């Protein structure tokens, strides 16, 4: 199993950024996006069930972020819009076996993280 994030960078306040997570080696797995600011815990952002594309969002992600999967390309995307300084963090993709109670309760596999920095 392998996860690799890309697309991190510096974004102007109000800007957009699309992150990619390349996955390999999968049963009924979820790919989630999690973010961690320096010295803070990991926060769930958005997750997708690879079987059927069902999605779940953190309140702050609703509307302005979209998580999607291209199973053919084995890539999951997080399209971010209306970015703000509070969105600055390392973003990780994580994989877990589908859990109907939600996303991020038993993350078994982690990517390497990609820095997102939002400034004016």
């Amino acid at each position: 199993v392998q996860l690799q994030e890309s697309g991190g960078g510096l974004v102007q306040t109000g800007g957009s950024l699309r992150l990619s997570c390349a996955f390999s080696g999968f049963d009924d797995y979820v790919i989630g996006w999690f973010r961690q600011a320096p010295g803070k815990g990991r926060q769930g952002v958005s997750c997708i069930r690879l079987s059927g594309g069902g999605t779940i969002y953190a309140d702050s992600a609703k509307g302005r972020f979209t998580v999607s999967a291209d199973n053919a390309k084995k890539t999951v995307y997080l399209q971010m819009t209306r970015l703000k300084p509070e969105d600055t963090a390392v973003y990780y993709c994580g994989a877990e076996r589908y859990n109907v109670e939600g996303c991020g309760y038993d993350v078994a596999y982690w990517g390497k993280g990609t820095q997102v920095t939002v400034s004016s």
Binding site: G41, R42, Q43, G44, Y57, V100, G102, G104, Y105, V107
Partner: peptide, 14 residues
């Protein structure tokens, strides 16, 4: 390693 999971409010557990 997740401080804040995303809870499904329409899950199995009552």
């Amino acid at each position: 390693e997740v401080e804040t999971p995303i809870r499904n409010e329409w899950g199995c557990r009552c």
